[PDB]
Design a protein around this motif. Sequence first.
Motif, PDB file in Angstrom:
ATOM      1  N   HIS A  58       0.828  -1.213   0.000  1.00  0.00           N
ATOM      2  CA  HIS A  58       0.000   0.000   0.000  1.00  0.00           C
ATOM      3  C   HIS A  58       0.851   1.247   0.000  1.00  0.00           C
ATOM      4  CE1 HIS A  58      -3.962   1.961   1.419  1.00  0.00           C
ATOM      5  NE2 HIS A  58      -3.103   2.948   1.245  1.00  0.00           N
ATOM      6  N   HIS A  60       1.096   5.373  -2.097  1.00  0.00           N
ATOM      7  CA  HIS A  60       0.499   6.312  -3.047  1.00  0.00           C
ATOM      8  C   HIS A  60       1.615   6.974  -3.817  1.00  0.00           C
ATOM      9  CE1 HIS A  60      -3.697   6.207  -1.423  1.00  0.00           C
ATOM     10  NE2 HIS A  60      -3.021   5.615  -0.454  1.00  0.00           N
ATOM     11  N   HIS A 211     -10.009   1.355   0.569  1.00  0.00           N
ATOM     12  CA  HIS A 211      -9.643   2.180   1.744  1.00  0.00           C
ATOM     13  C   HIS A 211     -10.846   2.084   2.673  1.00  0.00           C
ATOM     14  CE1 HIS A 211      -6.249   3.700  -0.509  1.00  0.00           C
ATOM     15  NE2 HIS A 211      -5.914   4.543   0.456  1.00  0.00           N
ATOM     16  N   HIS A 243      -6.378  -0.313   5.856  1.00  0.00           N
ATOM     17  CA  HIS A 243      -6.558   0.544   7.031  1.00  0.00           C
ATOM     18  C   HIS A 243      -7.406  -0.096   8.123  1.00  0.00           C
ATOM     19  CE1 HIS A 243      -4.159   3.941   5.743  1.00  0.00           C
ATOM     20  NE2 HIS A 243      -4.844   4.060   4.617  1.00  0.00           N
ATOM     21  N   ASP A 310       2.260   3.324   3.066  1.00  0.00           N
ATOM     22  CA  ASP A 310       1.135   4.212   2.754  1.00  0.00           C
ATOM     23  C   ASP A 310       1.578   5.493   2.009  1.00  0.00           C
ATOM     24  OD1 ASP A 310      -1.700   5.533   4.754  1.00  0.00           O
ATOM     25  OD2 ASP A 310      -1.305   5.534   2.589  1.00  0.00           O
TER      26      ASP A 310
HETATM   27 FE    FE Z   1      -3.549   4.860   1.236  1.00  0.00          FE
END
Ligand code: FE
Lengths: 423, 423
Positions: A58, A60, A211, A243, A310
């Motif tokens: 995970h 971004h 998410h 999450h 993340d």
């Molecule tokens: Fe994320």
Amino acid sequence: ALQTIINARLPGEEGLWQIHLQDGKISAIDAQSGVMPITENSLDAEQGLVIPPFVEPHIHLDTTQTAGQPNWNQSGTLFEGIERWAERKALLTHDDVKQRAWQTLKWQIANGIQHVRTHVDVSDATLTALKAMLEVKQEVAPWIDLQIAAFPQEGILSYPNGEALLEEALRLGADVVGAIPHFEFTREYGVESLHKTFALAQKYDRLIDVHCDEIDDEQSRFVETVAALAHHEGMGARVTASHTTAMHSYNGAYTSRLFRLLKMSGINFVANPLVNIHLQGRFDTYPKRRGITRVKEMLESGINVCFGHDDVCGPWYPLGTANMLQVLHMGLHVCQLMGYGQINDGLNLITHHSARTLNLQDYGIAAGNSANLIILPAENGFDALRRQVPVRYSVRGGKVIASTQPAQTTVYLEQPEAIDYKR
Amino acid sequence: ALQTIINARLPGEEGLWQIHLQDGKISAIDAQSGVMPITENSLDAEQGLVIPPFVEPHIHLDTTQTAGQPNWNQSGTLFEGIERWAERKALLTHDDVKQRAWQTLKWQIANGIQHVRTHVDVSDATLTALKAMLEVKQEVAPWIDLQIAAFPQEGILSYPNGEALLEEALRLGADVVGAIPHFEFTREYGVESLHKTFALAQKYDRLIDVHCDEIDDEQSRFVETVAALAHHEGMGARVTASHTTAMHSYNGAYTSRLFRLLKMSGINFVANPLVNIHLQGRFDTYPKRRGITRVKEMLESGINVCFGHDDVCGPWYPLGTANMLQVLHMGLHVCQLMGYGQINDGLNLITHHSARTLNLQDYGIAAGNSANLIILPAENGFDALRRQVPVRYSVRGGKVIASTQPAQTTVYLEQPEAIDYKR
Ligand SMILES: [Fe+3]
Ligand SMILES: [Fe+3]
């Protein structure tokens, strides 16, 4: 070049091991009864630990390396982070996205990460970052297998043409369908958005990564819909709930009921310890909750859970070197997985469990698999974790793609002494 | 008669101002550099504050003046109040309703209130109070612009023919469609009732004002549906959520998520401080929650919020003189809006913000508007609030419709001294 990895330790195994390589694959794995001599075409693990590559389940990559641009977050919340990101998103260019994604990807290669799932915000009619990331995926493929998750950051039902854009993202080649039900205007939009996400994943034969309940709200229970829909469609392996920080705040009775479904469904969970400890508990005064999902309980129940970074130097998290042992270190502490065995087994949370989450088909130190493996200068998972060791070698298709010559520390006492911090 | 208001202070403006009047309208507003002399056809504000009229955005004129009839409430709860009201509702007559509505309306005229939204219970096949109120609306029109909100007090889905009666009320001329989703038998009826309410408002081109989450239940979140439906229909300005007392009890994380929707939707909020402090927190022992909606936070976020009296000498509230400065005083205290500027700006909560809530088209001290304005014998909002001043003059269409000769207090010390409580 490489024909063998010698003098290898393997997690959960006694002694030393030789890993034979042929045609870019592992041909055989053989126990050793002592230390083997080095030779040309042997890579000496030097009684260090050999594991399949680290995985980033995970991240971004469209937001990476943008911390403070154009403004900082600030309150350190998920919600302000999204606002700050929206400001940065309006400024995206093709080359901007590719350059920043590549900067973080190189740190990941250096850190023995050969499998990465990046979310990419598709709440954007221009799909600028997605188009850039699809090129990056092809470019980095010699070193990293990059999955692209189409992430409707501003909602599917709560953003103009959100569902259409999500589907367009799949038509353009995104590997994974995303959703964000707790950010939708209403609980009903949240649930509906999941039906639509599952329908798209089945229409296009893609994975799902939601998410899911990233909020300190004890009433945010979208995870039950994610698991129930997976179970109904018989597609658990293909589904991930990222999450689930709300789960930290559930009453124990509901959680117990829920866990039966979570195990039956077979879905995967991603916890993001560095980011969760920072963004969660921001609405408490004191005492302040930790806000990580129920990792320890998941492990105890045989529910697949793993750790992601993340955000790396982005709108939600200003720090990071994309280092999975560091992510693991934070998660072990915050989750109180601090027993010797829990710490030692910690590597699973950033290797095997994450491979399962990515539905990987060719992963692990096993005969017939691609020769993709890394060498840590440590005796076992506990030692690797404690000393935060670098990746000595990263091997992909039987070729070295990264190496780290470790630091050398000397103290000048009555005589000079090398310090290695073992134990 | 009146051609000018002279020596006027205006909120947020320095100095004194002259307001010129022509043909029942404000023709021009001009700054003064000193005090102007009085003359015939000038109304002297005497360096008092001139504001557009007070507004009552939420009152129940069908229940007003019935406190203790036939029985008292008692537990001081919303729920017992509804039971006591139901007993009184069975006893309504046309003339009974008109007389009591008019008694409170006269107090309102005396208190400089020229805009009133009354709810009227339409959970009544006879529609007795509604028919009476429609006559009252026409009768009071020279002094007060009365909006009638059809209020399905016993539910839309939870009362026999509730939806039909609500629609009948609109067909008879009610200006605003009401709902009460937290009083419906189920959460699903609550949500469905809102769909039906919005559909009626769009069918008849009417405003919406929902009795929304008036309950100390952290799970009562009908407000998100009210806001989402408004946003979807692009009709935010026309929509109001009254009470939202449950919001006082939400966790901070959900509230933060929700606030984004609340601002995007553009809907209005009414808090009813005198009634909320009395009816909320009744199921706590100690400590006991205040139970007013998040007014301070709304103001900080630029969300339109305003104050109503709600009930005047009725089944829920045995006190009141229909005095908006008194409502404001209670709200500032309970909401802790106690900074000098917060108190001073308090007038907005009972003037401009309430006008927005009523979707008023001709409101404010501006050239071209109707000459509807009131004069408070006070230097600014803080002073008006502190001293709980009466309305010295109320002007409507450029004519005086109410006046108060203020009290005169003397203390007899060594010599007599007038006491005015300034500061
Ligand atoms: Fe994320
Ligand atoms: Fe009311």
